[PDB]
Design a protein around this ligand. Structure first.
Ligand SMILES: CC(C)=CCC/C(C)=C/CC/C(C)=C(\F)COP(=O)(O)OP(=O)(O)O
Ligand SMILES: [Mg+2]
Ligand SMILES: [Mg+2]
Ligand SMILES: [Mg+2]
Length: 527
């Protein structure tokens, strides 16, 4: 058997039992309702300037409380789009652009022309307006293939912000430094929200007290739910005891739950999160079995057993592979039960199909390993994409979503372009990150490898090539979000967020997640 030593879960049992102080919760909830209405009337406030209406929305979003005003914010942005009036300053133009695009409104990038010379190059004279540069920078990340008028925005705004940063007052200085490390659009929502509330807004001299309080109270209250969900999931995982039965598998239920929190954090997605975290944990095991344990023979049998998908096959499997197999079979049988109530069990199959698919590809992966085969990039991707596990997760995220319909699942089943881009981003960056290690273990069928061999190029060029793939992928994800959308935006976000997570997790080529996990599931925002 392969020699392995995954680090035991560094979390212990801190998340095993969480008792919600009902009083505090009802206390928090009660004021939040009040603060919610105050904020609402703030948005419905008439006679506001564009600049100001945009900042109010920008702030509410960064504070992570915008999920309470989806309609109001939509109408306000909608009307702004329709009245499409060109604002004269870089700062408002960039924010106006970003906010609309993120919401699907295909505002024209024409708005940025007045800010550049004849050769569509940004006017250097702008280099002295930090706020304008910051918003341009944040805006340059939501561009699509049709926005080549913004092909310099990123480099232009970056070089100057770096140059101006050191002498800026706080928290602005922190905000700029952070943005240069993590743009807003490609970051994990709750993660970016915790930072803004605590590190920026709270230290903002001009801060709106009603909003800040609202933001802190809401974040902390929601955290109670998350802490509550994680507690449940921790028992579930503990009461499976793979930690003992399957000593080869990792113990990362907490890390998985975090991933889930990145896809969606709102309370309505509570059940969704719990179903989704179970699949990630499970598939986590399967990977370990293929990646470091099972034998070509066993694996072969395992894959076959998964395709047939029926209890009886258990016998055909080794002892340990039976634990996995049955667990998996029961998991999906549970989803069906959970979905019985609302008669949405007919969809679970879509996820099962994704499972069988990923298992097949895992098997191919091992075969190419044994044969020592190095396929051409195209052949690699055809197998390697599914093993990012993204088709599986994306599909699974819909299960708990009470509004997902057969149509939604059918759209997803055809590998829509937005989904393909998200999967590629995961593949491309994971391959760039784990090239070294996998290279050592002798895995000749690794993306960067196939690339190098395929195009007869250096490890560098191969990684550069992959970067453009990911860049193109983002531009596609951004386009996918533009209206008219194939399905409801509600089902696009989970995909967008899956891409955001991978970017945040490999920001610098493990965990990484600790800090975040601590900031989101352990420490509360001190009010
Ligand atoms: C696909 C990746 C890497 C990350 C996405 C994050 C998630 C949600 C992972 C769960 C499934 C999985 C493939 C593992 F746990 C093993 O990754 P590991 O990198 O140890 O194994 P391989 O992806 O190399 O087989
Ligand atoms: Mg694997
Ligand atoms: Mg592995
Ligand atoms: Mg890898």
């Amino acid at each position: 058997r392969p020699v392995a030593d995954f680090s035991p879960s560094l979390w212990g049992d801190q998340f095993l039992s969480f008792s919600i102080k009902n009083q505090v919760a009802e206390k928090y909830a009660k004021e939040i309702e009040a603060l919610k209405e105050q904020t609402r009337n703030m948005l419905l406030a008439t006679g506001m300037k564009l600049a100001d209406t945009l900042n109010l929305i920008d702030t509410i979003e960064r504070l992570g409380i915008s999920y309470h005003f989806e309609k109001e914010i939509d109408d306000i942005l909608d009307q702004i789009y329709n009245q499409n009036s060109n604002c004269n300053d870089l700062c408002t133009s960039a924010l106006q652009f970003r906010l609309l695009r993120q919401h699907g409104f295909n505002i024209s990038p024409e708005i940025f022309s007045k800010f550049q010379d004849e050769n569509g190059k940004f006017k250097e004279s702008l280099a002295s307006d930090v706020l304008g540069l910051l918003n341009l920078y944040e805006a340059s990340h939501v561009r699509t293939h049709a926005d080549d008028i913004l092909e310099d925005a990123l480099a232009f705004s970056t070089i100057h912000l770096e140059s101006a940063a050191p002498h800026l007052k706080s928290p602005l200085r922190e905000q700029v430094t952070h943005a240069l490390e993590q743009c807003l659009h490609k970051g994990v929502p709750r993660v970016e929200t915790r930072f803004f509330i605590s590190s920026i807004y709270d230290k903002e001299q001009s801060k709106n007290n009603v909003l800040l309080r609202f933001a802190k109270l809401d974040f902390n209250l929601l955290q109670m739910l998350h802490k509550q969900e994680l507690a449940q999931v921790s028992r579930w995982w503990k009461d499976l005891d793979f930690v003992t039965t399957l000593p080869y598998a990792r113990d990362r239920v907490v890390e998985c739950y975090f991933w889930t929190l990145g896809v969606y954090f709102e309370p309505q997605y509570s059940q969704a999160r719990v179903m989704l975290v179970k699949t990630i944990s499970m598939i986590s095991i399967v990977d370990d079995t293929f990646d470091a344990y099972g034998t070509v023979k066993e694996l072969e049998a395992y894959t076959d057993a998964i395709q047939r998908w029926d209890i009886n096959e258990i016998d055909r499997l080794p002892d340990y592979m039976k634990i996995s197999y049955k667990a998996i079979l029961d998991l999906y049988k549970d989803y069906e039960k959970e979905l019985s109530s609302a008669g949405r069990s007919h969809i679970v199959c879509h996820a099962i199909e994704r499972m069988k698919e990923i298992v097949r590809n895992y098997n191919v992966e091992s075969t190419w390993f044994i044969e020592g085969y190095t396929p051409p990039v195209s052949e690699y991707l055809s197998n390697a994409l599914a093993t990012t596990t993204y088709y599986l997760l994306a599909t699974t995220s819909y299960l708990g979503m009470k509004s997902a319909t057969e149509q939604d699942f059918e759209w997803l089943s055809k590998n829509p372009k937005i989904l393909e881009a998200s999967v590629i981003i995961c593949r491309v960056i994971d391959d760039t990150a784990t090239y070294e290690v996998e290279k050592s273990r002798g895995q000749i069928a690794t993306g960067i490898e196939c690339c190098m061999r395929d195009y007869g190029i250096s490890t560098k060029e191969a990684m550069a090539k992959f970067q453009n793939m990911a860049e193109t992928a983002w531009k596609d994800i951004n386009e996918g979000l533009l209206r008219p959308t194939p399905v409801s935006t509600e089902f696009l976000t989970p995909i967008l967020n899956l891409a955001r997570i991978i970017e945040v997790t490999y920001i610098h080529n493990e965990k990484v997640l600790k800090p975040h996990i601590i900031n989101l599931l352990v420490d509360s925002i001190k009010i």
